[PDB]
């Protein structure tokens, strides 16, 4: 046999559900980061 890369995520069970949810949490943190940075950049380009 063989084990997949993200094999559990491939299965995506409650573990995979957690994978999705933590992706949500961390990627949303980074997304707020990128969005705030872009707001700052827009503020910078305003002048």
């Amino acid at each position: 046999v063989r084990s997949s890369a993200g094999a559990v995520r491939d299965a995506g069970g409650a573990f995979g559900k957690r994978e999705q949810a933590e992706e949500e949490r961390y990627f949303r943190a980074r997304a707020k980061e990128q969005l705030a940075a872009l707001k700052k950049h827009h503020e910078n380009e305003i002048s």
Binding site: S4, A5, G6, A7, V8, R9, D10, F15, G16, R18, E19, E22, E23, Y26, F27, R30, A31, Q34, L35, A37, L38, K39, H41, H42
Partner: protein, 469 residues
């Protein structure tokens, strides 16, 4: 001679004909039925009555019904002349317009391309499709299998791709609703009326209508394979125009020959199919394509019903599919629209000698990056982005962005997808790929790349987000 109804549970009928059994591929009409009921002689059982493939409803028949022996397959005209109406394989124009009579008329049972006389090159039949160009660019006139499921975007992506390419077919074209919905039949009729690549009243028919609908039983629904092969041969020579061919769907079609095998008492395959159901289907795949005087840019739908990726039906599908279109219904479940199985589909125009070293290399690196995305996804599922390494969190964001940039909402999709189509330029696609490799939106949100066209358009969308934030 003339067969006479003898003894049958329906269409599996050896009709008593005074002389013997006609030659192979014999399709004879039932004299004495409600409608023109052509039945195909298929079992060389002898007995002056050959168990014959009747495509029609057998009800009402009385034993002894003497039928008209023809002796060969159905003959109807072909060529680009028949274009403009919608006709049956028997030639029955079901466009409520009577016989759309053409010139080139012949029987359907024939051979495949010659061992020395076909076309021997592959030309990328580009269409500017975001994902398809991004990784798996197609080619001219090949066996491209559309691995998608039922209600799985196959008809949705089909509408998008029809809107994209069909309006500008190289020559004439053909489309088959092989077991398509009758509701879909009427809707597709209205759509062709509103499509112009084929025009109902107008002679703008760079396309050919064909229907093998689900309410049409297999006897016809399983039989239109030879009709499509002959139509492709015509577009090669008789219709003689650079033609892409649409035919959907074949899963219920090969399954239809399977269901027929039982009446044949033919051996159930692994999925119960006819043992030679594969033989025909592979041979069906061998009939008409790009050749010296042949050319068929036929689009082949690879239905994976029940999402059974390794289906024996999918097995035969992969067996001859010169081009692969692997959907990832999981991706669509994740909201992907496009949603293909990226590291899965194969296409020859994705090669350094073909795609160019840059494009093929970029696509392969994208595949590797997405593989890492999957791998580390579970890894995170264990730990999470708390341990996200510098190379890793970077990889995570980049892979999310690649997935985002993968999809786009079309204008025909804008009916549901809201966003109208973005005509993705190939150079724009490769440029967005290189920029993402650089990280063109490191400070920005990848969600702009989602359901988007050009990467610059995504930068604009992210700025719009900055406004809406």
């Amino acid at each position: 001679t003339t067969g006479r109804i003898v003894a049958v549970i329906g269409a599996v009928v050896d009709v008593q004909f005074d002389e013997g059994l006609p030659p192979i591929l014999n399709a004879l009409e039932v004299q004495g039925r409600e409608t023109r009921l052509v039945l195909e002689v298929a079992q060389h059982l002898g007995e002056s009555t050959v168990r014959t493939i009747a495509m029609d409803g057998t009800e009402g028949l009385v034993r002894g019904q003497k039928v008209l022996d023809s002796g060969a397959p159905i003959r109807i005209p072909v060529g680009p002349e028949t274009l403009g109406r919608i006709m049956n394989v028997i030639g029955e124009p079901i466009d409520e317009r009577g016989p759309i009579k053409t010139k080139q008329f012949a029987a359907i049972h024939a051979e495949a391309p010659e061992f020395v006389e076909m076309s021997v090159e592959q030309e990328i039949l580009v269409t500017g499709i975001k994902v398809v160009d991004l990784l798996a660019p197609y080619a001219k006139g090949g066996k491209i299998g559309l691995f998608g499921g039922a209600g799985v975007g196959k008809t949705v992506l089909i509408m998008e791709l029809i809107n994209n390419v069909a309006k500008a077919h190289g020559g004439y074209s053909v489309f088959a609703g092989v077991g398509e919905r009758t509701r879909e039949g009427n809707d597709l009729y209205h759509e062709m009326i509103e499509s112009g690549v084929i025009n109902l009243k107008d002679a703008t028919s760079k396309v050919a209508l064909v229907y093998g609908q689900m309410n049409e039983p297999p006897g016809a629904r399983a039989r239109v394979a030879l009709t499509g092969l002959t139509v492709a041969e015509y577009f090669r020579d008789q219709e003689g125009q650079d033609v892409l061919l649409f035919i959907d769907n074949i899963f219920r079609f090969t399954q239809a020959g399977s269901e027929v095998s039982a009446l044949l008492g033919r051996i159930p395959s692994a999925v119960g199919y006819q043992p030679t159901l594969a033989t025909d289907m592979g041979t069906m795949q061998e009939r008409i394509t790009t050749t010296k005087k042949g050319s068929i840019t036929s689009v082949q739908a690879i239905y994976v019903p029940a999402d059974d990726l390794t289906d024996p039906a999918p097995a035969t599908t992969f067996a001859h599919l010169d081009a692969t279109t692997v959907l990832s219904r999981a991706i669509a479940e994740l909201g992907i629209y496009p949603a293909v199985d990226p590291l899965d589909s194969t296409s020859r125009i994705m090669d350094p000698n073909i795609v160019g070293s840059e494009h093929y290399d970029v696509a392969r690196g994208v595949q590797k990056i997405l593989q890492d995305y999957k791998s580390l996804q579970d890894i995170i599922a264990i730990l999470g982005m708390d341990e996200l390494s510098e190379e890793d969190k970077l990889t995570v964001s980049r892979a999310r962005k690649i997935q985002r940039f993968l999809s786009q909402p079309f204008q025909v999709a804008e009916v549901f997808t809201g966003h109208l189509g973005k005509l993705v330029p190939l150079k724009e696609t490769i440029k967005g790929f290189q920029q993402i490799l650089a990280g063109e939106y490191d400070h920005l949100p990848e969600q702009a790349f989602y359901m988007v066209g050009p990467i610059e358009e995504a930068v604009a969308k992210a700025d719009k987000l900055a406004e809406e934030h």
